[PDB]
Amino acid sequence: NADDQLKQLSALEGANGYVIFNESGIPLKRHEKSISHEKAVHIAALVSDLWNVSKKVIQRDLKTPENDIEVIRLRTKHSYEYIITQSGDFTMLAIQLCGKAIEEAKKAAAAAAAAAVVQEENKEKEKK
């Protein structure tokens, strides 16, 4: 059941990886494409500092009572997108790409497949 959500996140177009953070900062589950645990430990520390600072800043720095940030989306260079949503005590980071980025990724995958096929052909030739 829980495993299916990770598969569902991958299924959505423009999604690269999903990282989930506990209140302590331990990464519950991360995507296989992205680095597992080492990247999660590095991503969880940065998001907690950002989410905590933003949550604290909105309440006091903006002088607005009972105002809480719900979703933070950071758009950077190339196709990077990092939507952050907090549910209960768990906050996760999702990395999605634009249409051009997705096309580039598909092209790269195709190239990799072609390379693998070429290697297989070479192996067959060597066997012959």
Partner 1 sequence: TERVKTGDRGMSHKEGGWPGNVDPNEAQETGRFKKRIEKSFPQAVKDLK
Partner 2 sequence: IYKTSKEIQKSDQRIIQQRVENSIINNQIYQKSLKRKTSKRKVRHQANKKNFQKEMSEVEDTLNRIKTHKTVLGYLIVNSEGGVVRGAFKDEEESKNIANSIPLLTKKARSVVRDLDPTNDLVFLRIQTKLNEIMVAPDDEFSLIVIQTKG
Partner 3 sequence: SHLDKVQPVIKNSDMSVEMQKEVEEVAKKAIDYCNTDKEIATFIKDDFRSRYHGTWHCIVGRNFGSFVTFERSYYIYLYVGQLAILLFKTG
Q: Are 83 and 71 in contact (CB under 8 A)?
A: yes
> Hey, which residues does 94 pair with through a beta bridge?
18, 83
Residue 32: enclosing H or E segment and its boundaries? none
Say whether residue 48 binds partner 3 (CB under 8 A): yes
Taking CA atoms, 84 is separated from 22, 63, 97, in Å, by: 13, 23, 15
By C-beta, is 70 or 126 nearer to partner 1? 70
* DSSP state letter for 77: S
Q: Residue 128 is encoded by which pair of tokens?
A: 């012959």
Q: How far is the CB of 49 from partner 2 (least distance, A)?
A: 7
Helix (H, G, I), strand (E, B) or coil at 34: coil
Q: Residue 120 is encoded by which pair of tokens?
A: 């297989």
The residue range among 18-26, 77-85, 104-112, 114-122 that interacts with partner 3, by the rule CB under 8 A, is: 18-26
Say whether residue 28 binds partner 3 (CB under 8 A): no
Interface with partner 2 in residues 79-98 (CB under 8 A) = 80, 82
Find which of partner 1, partner 3, partner 2, none residue 96 binds, CB within 5 to 8 Å per kind.
none
* DSSP state letter for 92: E
Interacting residues with partner 1 (CB under 8 A): 1-2, 5-6, 8-9, 18, 20, 22, 24-29, 41-42, 44-45, 85-88, 90, 92
Q: Where along the sequence are the contacts to partner 2 (CB under 8 A)? A: 39, 42-43, 46-47, 49-50, 53-54, 57-58, 61-64, 66-78, 80, 82
